[PDB]
């Protein structure tokens, strides 16, 4: 039943009727501008235990502020021996590299650090990267294409999420630290793969983290190793926050469980800025992996080489860490004391909870769901579903009122302690638009090896009183 | 103004200054215009160029 079915004069009418949208929406800029005004700024002195800060365009100034918002833990890069190596290199090498990796870019100090990392961490090779934020999304896509299988945890960080989106492969999720969910999921995938009788076996990976960035938990490595060999998978572990703080010496997560890295883990991603004290990152693995990254990684091939003084300082730190292991022992004693001081308090049970392991050097605090529902009247499950719909529908404006109220309340806790007691504790900084998995606001208190137990104890009591007074 | 740099004397200019050029030129023309350098162990492909012997005989 076939049914019965433009002029150039009206083409310009369509062009003139087009009304484009602004590049950036300024409607909600004013209401969300308090974050910039509350950012501390250090004045002419390095970030250390005692600092002098100014906020809100030099309007307010504080002197001798106890610092608890620094990611540096070992504090070995401020010592005299490291400063001697840094100054000598500049006089003989300069500050810049001036060249890519493949065009006269290696200055025979980059090769030395690659050898040092493999011997210290017990692997076969290493590859250096300019920035840690651009390491995971540059190595994972190189070994995965369409038709592959990736199994990931439901609490991974944003940089890991970016890698899985660009990987262009099937992605599955299992419950947070649940081997029953993982083992059940793997069995079905293997059986259907055998049933289809594919000509070749595709690549399969497992993605997890050592110490989680948003919660502070651990991963049960002995269980994962047994399952991956049983079902013929591969393990991918990110160790940004677990190298230098776990183990007798600081080798990483494998030394904590008394294992071998050559067989337990296949890909390791780390950062040199958290504990070592220098910019950059690295990826650890075997020889066949490394040769493919020299030509298959976009970040490695299409970027300038890392400066020279950063490389030399890290090698000195690694040599010092091998001889003596007193910095790690001091860090672990303080971390255990900090966790127990916030977990054995009966006055904070009905207000906040602790979601961190004792071995972690950062303590995370979150509001109880009963208290959040009483005041703000919203649930994390409800918050997740609202943002998911907005992203799919591609709306220009993404503003949620109950979410903003909690952020302001947590800022009041931070501000109250600093003004009255001169203690600086930070707040977790996240962007809700870019997230894909559920997340909630929290607080953070850090520790390092340059502190004294008496000073830390007084700071803990002050923050506990600050929370109660605000609530 | 002195720098720690060594200058390589140029051939045909203060190198040979202080019957065979035709053969060298012909060899360079034969070699560089054909695909030989990116080959390994394949110097035996020159044997395939025996067509000169085949076309040498006339009538």
């Amino acid at each position: 039943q076939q049914k019965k079915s433009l002029s150039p004069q009206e083409i310009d009418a369509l062009i003139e009727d087009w009304e484009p949208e602004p590049l950036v929406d300024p409607s909600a800029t004013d209401e969300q501008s308090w974050r910039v005004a509350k950012t501390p700024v250090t004045m002419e002195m390095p970030i250390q235990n005692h600092i002098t800060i100014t906020r809100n365009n030099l309007q307010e100034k504080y002197t001798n502020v106890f610092n608890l918002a620094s990611n540096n833990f070992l504090q070995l890069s401020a010592t005299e021996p490291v400063k001697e190596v840094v100054k000598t290199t500049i006089k003989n090498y300069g500050v810049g590299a001036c060249g890519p990796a493949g065009f006269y870019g290696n200055q025979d100090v980059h090769y030395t650090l690659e050898y040092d990392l493999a011997q210290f961490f017990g692997t076969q090779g290493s590859v250096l990267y300019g920035q840690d934020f651009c390491a995971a999304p540059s190595v994972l896509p190189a070994f995965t294409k369409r038709g592959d299988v990736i199994v990931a945890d439901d609490q991974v960080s944003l940089p890991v999420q970016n890698a899985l989106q660009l990987s262009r492969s099937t992605v599955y999720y299992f419950n947070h630290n649940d081997m029953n969910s993982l083992e059940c999921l793997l069995n079905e995938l293997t059986e259907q793969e055998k049933l289809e009788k594919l000509p070749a076996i595709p690549r399969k990976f497992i993605v997890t983290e050592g110490i989680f960035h948003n919660s502070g938990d651990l991963a049960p490595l002995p269980e994962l190793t047994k399952l991956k060999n049983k079902y013929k998978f591969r393990l991918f572990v990110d160790e940004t926050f677990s190298i230098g703080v776990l183990g007798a010496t600081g080798r990483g997560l494998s030394e904590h469980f008394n294992m071998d890295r050559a067989t337990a883990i296949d890909i390791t991603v780390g950062s040199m800025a958290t504990a070592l004290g220098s910019t950059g990152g690295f990826v650890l693995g075997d020889s066949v992996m490394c040769l493919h990254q020299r030509i298959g990684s976009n970040a490695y091939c299409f970027s300038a080489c890392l400066p020279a003084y950063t490389v030399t300082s890290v090698s000195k730190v690694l040599k010092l860490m091998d001889s003596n292991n007193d910095a790690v022992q001091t860090l672990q004693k303080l971390s255990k004391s900090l966790h127990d001081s916030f977990a054995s308090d009966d006055s904070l049970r009905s207000y906040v909870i602790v979601t961190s392991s004792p071995v972690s050097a950062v303590l995370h605090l979150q509001l109880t769901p009963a208290y959040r529902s009483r005041k703000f009247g919203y649930t994390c499950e409800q918050l997740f579903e609202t943002m998911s719909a907005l992203q799919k529908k591609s709306q220009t404006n993404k503003f949620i009122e109950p979410y903003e109220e909690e952020e302001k309340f947590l800022q009041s806790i931070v501000d109250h302690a600093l003004i009255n007691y001169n203690v600086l504790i930070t707040r977790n900084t996240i962007v809700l638009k870019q997230e894909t998995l559920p997340i909630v606001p929290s607080l953070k208190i850090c520790c390092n090896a340059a502190m004294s137990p008496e000073e830390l104890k007084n700071a803990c009591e002050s923050v506990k009183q600050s929370i109660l007074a605000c609530c | 103004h002195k720098s720690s740099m060594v200058y390589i004397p140029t051939t045909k200019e203060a190198k040979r200054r202080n019957l065979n050029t035709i053969e060298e030129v012909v060899e360079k023309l034969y070699w560089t215009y054909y695909i030989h350098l990116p080959f390994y162990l394949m110097a035996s492909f020159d044997s395939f160029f025996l067509h000169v012997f085949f076309l040498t005989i006339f009538s």
């Binding site: 083409i11 062009i15 484009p20 949208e21 590049l23 950036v24 501008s33 974050r35 950012t39 501390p40 700024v41 250090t42 004045m43 002195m45 390095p46 970030i47 610092n67 918002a69 620094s70 990611n71 890069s77 401020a78 500049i90 006089k91 003989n92 300069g94 500050v95 810049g96 590299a97 990796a101 290696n106 025979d108 100090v109 090769y111 300019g130 920035q131 934020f133 651009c134 944003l158 660009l166 076996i201 013929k232 004290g277 976009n298 300038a304 591609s394 930070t426 962007v431 | 103004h1 720098s3 390589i8 140029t10 360079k28 070699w31 560089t32 215009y33 695909i35 030989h36 350098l37 990116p38």
Partner: protein, 555 residues
Amino acid sequence: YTRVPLCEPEELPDDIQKENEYGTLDSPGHLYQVKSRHGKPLPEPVVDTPPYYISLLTYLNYLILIILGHVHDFLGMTFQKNKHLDLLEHDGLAPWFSNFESFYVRRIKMRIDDCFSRPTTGVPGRFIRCIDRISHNINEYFTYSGAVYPCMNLSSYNYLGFAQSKGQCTDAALESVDKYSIQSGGPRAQIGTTDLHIKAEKLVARFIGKEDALVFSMGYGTNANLFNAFLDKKCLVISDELNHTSIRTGVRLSGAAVRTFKHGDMVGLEKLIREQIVLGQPKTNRPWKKILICAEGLFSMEGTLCNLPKLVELKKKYKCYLFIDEAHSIGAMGPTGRGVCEIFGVDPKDVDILMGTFTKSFGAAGGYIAADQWIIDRLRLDLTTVSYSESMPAPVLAQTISSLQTISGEICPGQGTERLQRIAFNSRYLRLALQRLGFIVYGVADSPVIPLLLYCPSKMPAFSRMMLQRRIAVVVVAYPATPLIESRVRFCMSASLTKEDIDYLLRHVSEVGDKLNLKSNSGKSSYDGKRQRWDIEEVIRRTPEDCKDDKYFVN
């Protein structure tokens, strides 16, 4: 022997080191000032071609290479498997990479791999020191010996000669190390920000000419993590076919529709804009939410400039937005060094977003973005790198601030202009001499990158090895980076080189090219329409005076 040696620094007097890193001008007649084009549009570029037999020989060579490579792969992987244990399944596990996706690297480039990844040492100034190595098997593994020899530098991104270990910048960096440690606390949102960051941002904003600017630690991350902040699946991006991989990665992460237009073709761009405005989104025909145009200032592989006024008038007429990258144009192009905007005289207010990198000219590592006030205020809250990544170290900030202040003229008077004049004169002289000899040279008259075409694939290793034997460092590129017919050698000029070094390079290059028969000019390079096969002495005698005149350059 297998491991790369660690070289002990040599002991030399100060003057020898300064001469090694930076040259001293001989006469004041080797400087040139760059004029500004007020109302002269860029003419369409003209290219030159070699005769047909070069192309036919190239095609035959590639055909033979492909046939023998595939035959070798098949026979070797069928008749034996013990040696090829990295490309077959083992204990039920797939291999790391695939056979077909890595054919070129293993079968063509591996035989000439000695020309890539050359270790060096010391400062990358006028003379660069290299470590010797001995090739084993067929470029499989190398053995190193304790010997280091200097070489002339023509392969490093050092335009204004800021890669020095003796000067104001080094002292500033050392003082910064003394005051601020090399430690960075964390992300800029939490603890990372200090006063030096604000000083650098304000100074950059004042130097470029916009209202405000931000700083970053890596140039790649500036592009890779930017477009997702204000683009979505209902926007269109029109970009040139020749853009860096960072832009493509950022757009892929964003998810917007991508349409490309041919390089140097404005009519096709206008047609594409009109058609995309009329048609709308696929399958629904709703109008596009917004349209963004991406372009780059100077293209490094060809040394050609983009036509800015045409893009500005097109975006003003059709209500679009513009994005300009200035990695190779900042600090080295223009009467002062502002960029292509100063060359063309276009006000910076027209361009919505500007970008740059400090590695190519200022001898540091980082990047920046410059825009209006409200755009930056929103992007600061909406960005990912600010609140998830590390922060810039202090010595790099000190080096960048010192370099920008020196170029601006606040400190060390009479240095930036002299460097700019040196680099302009060097580029013009080298390009004119190379064209007069009989070679093929691409690009505009004043461009630090000089690409010389070497068509036959077998002529790259020979040229590179002969140049290395004569103590000159060169960089060669080939397929698939460049088209199949056209393979080229890239020259990067510096302000530290001297006319005597240029003469030395010209003599050696001319004789090597005569040996390898690389002179193929069809007469379209000459302004008088005749073939040019001169002598080296005549060129050396006449070119430096005529280098300043602008009537000897076709484009």
